Amino acid sequence: SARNEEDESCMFALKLLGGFAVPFTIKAVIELGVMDQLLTAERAMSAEELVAAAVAAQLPRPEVACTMVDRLLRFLASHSVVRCTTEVVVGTDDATTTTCCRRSYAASPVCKWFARNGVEDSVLPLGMMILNKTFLDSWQNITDAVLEGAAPFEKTYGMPMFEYLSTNGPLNTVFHEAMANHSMIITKKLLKFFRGFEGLDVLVDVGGGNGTTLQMIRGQYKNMRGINYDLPHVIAQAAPVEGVEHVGGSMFDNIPRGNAVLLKWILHDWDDKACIKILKNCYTALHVRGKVIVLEYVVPDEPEPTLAAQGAFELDLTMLVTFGSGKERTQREFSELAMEAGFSREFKATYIFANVWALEFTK
């Protein structure tokens, strides 16, 4: 900047307004198959090489497609998402957006999180939900929804998100693969780092889906039995799981009895009154010394400008947009709810991965 500091203020303002460009560009680079080619490459590749390898079809305008991809990747290079090298061309190049010199690109480490295959410890499924147009369009109606005290999503589509999925099979698939992708990674990391399944006879997984989380947990605690508690329609679609009883119900009526209850990414959908109802049912269903295991992000007590804190408040806003009064909570807030619900002044927190903690409350 011309110093000024005024100039840098101005450019900073523009950066803030333009923060959508990176996500949308990475999505394009993924969809085009360019990202997968960067992830399987032995060396830096030009846009021309990356297009020829990603795309089988004959392209109507092959030179234009190549210079556009170059421009995509050059921008991602300025944000450190890919590495760029520039070399002089012996002649002239028709597939670069510069005609002295060719740029070649390689994946930065972070790009492994966008892989379509591998062992599928990627966040791509969750990424195509985050950048799904149907979900993104809600973010344009925040203002009106705040004024009405409503969820932006419901102001955009006229019903709650979970109801809307019922009318939209493709979005419903994107949503379920994202949730399953996330649950897969957290469950593996939970089994690596968390010790609070040891000694449990019966684990109730509230929102257990097809019961895969209980299966994977039981793979490690063979003597443990599980209750996959989920809505009657979700229970129905579930194949039998050795050691696991599938039970249908609403967590608002009742939760099955067990030594521990697992709530993964449940309470953040709901406001305090609903969360105190879920936790009171957790209470009545446990014996003394039984616990709730809450798998959730935890927002700091004050808005720190760190990578973790930003991530957390960003998930908060995603809950705002999605559900309105669903929210991300501090540890203190999780504690207050657990205490309102009758749980004791005995709190454990174990950091798992990607801002998810396992918080444990004891009856």
Added chain:
Amino acid sequence: SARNEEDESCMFALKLLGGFAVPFTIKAVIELGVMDQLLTAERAMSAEELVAAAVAAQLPRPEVACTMVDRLLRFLASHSVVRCTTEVVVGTDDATTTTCCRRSYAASPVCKWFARNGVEDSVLPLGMMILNKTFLDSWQNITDAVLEGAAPFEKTYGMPMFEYLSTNGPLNTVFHEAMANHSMIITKKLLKFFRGFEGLDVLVDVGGGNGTTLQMIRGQYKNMRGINYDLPHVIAQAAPVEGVEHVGGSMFDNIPRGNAVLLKWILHDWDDKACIKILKNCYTALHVRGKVIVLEYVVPDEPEPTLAAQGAFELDLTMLVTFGSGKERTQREFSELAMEAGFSREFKATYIFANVWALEFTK
């Protein structure tokens, strides 16, 4: 210590995919009138005071509205866009998203760029274009546009952007206000920092609109005659201006004769062959020792990870999305075009403001 690394990398991937949240939250805080309250406030104010000052209307759910705005502001505070202080509540609170303690917010300096009339000059009209739904939607169709070698805009709406604006008066207004806003800031900055208007008898402003740029330029260089040259339909609606001749025409036919020709944000709309045609007309229009003055961003010849270079590549992708073959160019590329068009190996560059340079080529 490679768990830390895997975790950091994963969070960085999520940050990259979630970078739309900031722009969209800023838009909400502005549209709600909260940003202007921040900009005129004496001290830090709570979301509840900010909503009470910004909203005249009566609200159906005022507590919910307040806690939602708190959540928006807390997130912007984690991005350093606003300042936040936290104080214990010695009473009874449900208008922050925590009951123990109230957050109060103040504007960071960067927020003056988001003024409606809050604090001064601002890039709000430009940002309302940037975050306009119609323009943003195009970013979702980059993948297919690349494959067909087309502008994402054309692939989303079935025709080019200038065509489409003719059929959408509200968006045509948004587009024109953004360009007037940016032209106004840059003209003022040009008169502070640029010295290439001195000694000119006749300056031709190609695309001059209603002729404000020459008026303000004449406001400083009294003996300068302007020619405000633009499309016949734009010249129709222009009130007279002392010392400025309004001439309708197209720049691809002819340019009026002059000592200098000003091209502000014209060449970046067009591919090389179109830019060389514009500049060859600029050539023929000038006497020897006359100048073309180009007002443009200038990309670095390599993708540096600085605020400035990211800004410039961000504008290049905006041109890609909007026009396809519109592009930002390096200094060498601007030079190659000018020399193709007959200009001397005699090149000047003066940095203006918000990434804009005034480059001058001589005959």
